[PDB]
Design a protein around this nucleic acid. Structure first.
Lengths: 170, 170, 170, 169
DNA sequence: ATAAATT
DNA sequence: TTAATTA
């Protein structure tokens, strides 16, 4: 039904780790959530599940990862994210970078170049800009930075209570 | 003053154990010779050295490897060779495959393709066919293939006196 | 929509403190300018962007910095600058020394000539005089010195005001 | 009377820990030698001193530095070394690499670019080839190859006893 | 007194 | 369903 938590993730690299450390912990504070695993590849956009999700979902939490440049499906997802955000700024974005530098989002260099260069031999000549623009417009909004060294856990604590706050009082 | 034996090489992966032996070993026979040498990179078609010696040659003996596709340069050198050979079939080739089998290296598959596709999308959208139809003609003429074990000494000898026969006595 | 204010500066030496800071302050004051960041290396100095702007340009503002010598394209940039200054002196130049001393740059002394000691056996042994004539020409026009103490605050504020006043009340 | 084992060295960059140490130890065997420090600088051709010693001595021992090529004065000296060598192979060589490996000397390549690269800017395109051709030929004969950690003192001994043997026998 | 391709 | 630097 109506819930306020839509997510995202990399594929094999971190989806399982995040489900183990954040998703449950969230469920322990009484908030219905959402996500899934399937890869389709029989087309590009699943209808009233992907779309019911983005539509009714409220405050997004896109855990960008150090591989978040390979999945065309993931690239088109965060897109519609930033799109249906820019309509009525009462729903808010909460980015949480991971391992990969927050210096590599305001211009896409470093670990992404081999990804895009081969990704650019394939798809459109235009829409790729409406993706690049969105991946631009996160590296400014606020951001828990969790490096590879700081305690990769109880930051879960610090990060849940907040998502509670923006709901309890309003 | 004019030599009688051309050559060709990849670069930083057989400028040591094999080739150099063959050069010195050959000089040890009074068969005045030539080879590739300069770390030049200069030009995309240099004339008054190669393009003098090539049509000054008499016997061709390239030495493929497992990365012989990377060449933006030696590749067309091989091309120039196989072409000009077609003019006067009074001079022959005698290539000796190296480490990689003479199968996956006659149809641009195996660990050889991904280098060619990197050097296929790069330039003249027609010339790639010219390079492939150049590499193809080689992998038929007989040749003392070398593997991991065949002692790198004996093969040198057996390639010597042979190279001699088609020069001294015909 | 035409571009009215030009710049030129060594790259990795004020890509992270001033040049940006200045451009941002400017665009928050209503003035359509242009700079860029493409290293080219596909010729000498192209047309459809730099030659477009410079000829259609107006108010010149370049910025010397302690790397302002190895500018194989950018020194040329200054050349074109000073020669497209040679037609109607109704467009001026307000260069601002930065960190580098004000008068040591009139003869390339101090820590400057060591660029030249090797920068004479590479490019043309004659046009160097037409480069040095220009790099001499700046050391004269009245404006703002900046050391390491005059903090990069106010300088922004004033260096805006002049540029605007040469547009509003003429 | 006359010198017996003529030396050479880098300029200042190794006038402490090694060279000297070697010189004293050598002299403690009773084998008359040479070494001088005079800087000339009154030109470039020094005559009746080493130019008498080079055609007067016997068995050599040129050492290389981390930057021997940069020194024009020592370079030209090793030149005449190899040249008064070439006329007869009765007198030997006996090099000793040091602060550089024979991985970058049979090539004048590697850290030598800083040297030759602007050592030539003034000098002709022929003499450079002559010198370089001389520096090449040391890269062959035998090498103690004193390295970064090997104790230098243990090699002074193992480099004296030899020169001794090549004098008694 | 200390940069180089697209080897 | 993988990749070069003379700002």
């Amino acid at each position: 039904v109506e819930y306020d938590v839509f997510l995202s993730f990399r594929g094999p690299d971190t989806r399982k780790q995040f489900t183990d450390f954040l998703y449950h912990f969230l469920c322990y504070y009484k908030i219905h959530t959402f996500r899934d695993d399937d890869e389709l590849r029989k087309g590009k956009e699943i209808g009233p599940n992907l779309l019911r999700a983005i539509d009714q979902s409220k405050i997004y939490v896109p855990i960008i990862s150090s591989g978040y440049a390979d999945s065309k499906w993931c690239l088109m997802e965060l897109a519609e994210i930033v799109r249906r955000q820019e309509e009525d700024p009462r729903r808010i974005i909460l980015p949480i970078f991971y391992m990969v530098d927050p210096s590599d989002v305001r211009h896409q260099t470093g670990c992404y170049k081999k990804a895009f260069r081969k990704h650019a031999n394939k798809f459109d000549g235009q829409t790729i800009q409406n993706w690049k623009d969105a991946l631009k417009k996160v590296g400014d909004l606020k951001g828990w930075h969790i490096g590879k060294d700081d305690e990769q856990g109880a930051i879960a604590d610090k990060v849940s209570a907040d998502i509670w706050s923006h709901i309890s009082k309003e």
